[PDB]
Scaffold this motif. Structure first.
Motif, PDB file in Angstrom:
ATOM      1  N   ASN B  28       0.814  -1.208   0.000  1.00 28.92           N
ATOM      2  CA  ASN B  28       0.000   0.000   0.000  1.00 28.92           C
ATOM      3  C   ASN B  28       0.850   1.262   0.000  1.00 28.92           C
ATOM      4  O   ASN B  28       1.401   1.674   1.015  1.00 28.92           O
ATOM      5  CB  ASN B  28      -0.964   0.006   1.187  1.00 28.92           C
ATOM      6  N   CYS B  36      -1.876   6.359  -5.931  1.00 30.84           N
ATOM      7  CA  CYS B  36      -1.436   5.687  -4.711  1.00 30.84           C
ATOM      8  C   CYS B  36      -2.583   4.927  -4.067  1.00 30.84           C
ATOM      9  O   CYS B  36      -3.730   5.329  -4.153  1.00 30.84           O
ATOM     10  CB  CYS B  36      -0.910   6.684  -3.689  1.00 30.84           C
ATOM     11  N   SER B  37      -2.256   3.837  -3.397  1.00 28.56           N
ATOM     12  CA  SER B  37      -3.238   3.074  -2.660  1.00 28.56           C
ATOM     13  C   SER B  37      -3.892   4.046  -1.680  1.00 28.56           C
ATOM     14  O   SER B  37      -5.111   4.091  -1.562  1.00 28.56           O
ATOM     15  CB  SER B  37      -2.544   1.911  -1.932  1.00 28.56           C
TER      16      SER B  37
END
Lengths: 109, 107
Positions: B28, B36-37
């Motif tokens: 993550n 981005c996660s």
């Protein structure tokens, strides 16, 4: 406890228990382990007389002082470890560590 | 759209609204980029700021800083997290990415 508050000290959920809000009033607010303290945080890592949040007026900014705590008082943005008795002006929403406990000051509306 | 194992809570007041980001098995990426996660569109947040790795549902997430400009702060114990160094996330753990306060929750 009929003293009109001007600030708020918020404690976040942790191991010590759930979130919680503490009222802050004009003049001095003593942070400590003792049930009589204006901000009473009955956790053994907090000193009996740990810190002092002093508020003089509204449009102003509170003053935080560490009272010579064992486990220290720190501010976080940017980080700094407060030296005993040294006055530190808190900005609204400032993050504060007393020992391991993370707190956030809020100025009311 | 993947089943999350955990969640990162972002605190608000004057730093977004109170938003939750899902954390899934694997890597993550926490950063500024929308892809981005954990996308944190704030100018103190690096494009690739930090990484939370979840190696299994039962194991503590692993937090690392990706050489971010403003740094990652842990509080167990209070310390700037050096890039490369791994840190295990406990339930309810508070952390700061640059100036942004977050809280981890195992779901």
């Amino acid at each position: 406890c009929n003293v009109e508050p001007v600030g708020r000290l918020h404690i976040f959920s942790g191991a010590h228990g759930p979130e919680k809000d503490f009222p802050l009033h004009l003049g001095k607010n003593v942070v400590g382990r003792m049930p009589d303290c204006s901000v009473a945080l009955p956790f053994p890592s907090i000193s009996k007389q740990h810190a002092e949040i002093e508020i003089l007026a509204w449009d102003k900014a509170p003053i935080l002082r560490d009272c010579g705590s064992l486990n220290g008082t720190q501010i976080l943005r940017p980080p700094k470890v407060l030296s005993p008795g040294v006055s530190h002006r808190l900005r609204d929403q400032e993050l504060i560590l007393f020992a391991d406990l993370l707190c956030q000051y809020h100025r009311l509306d």
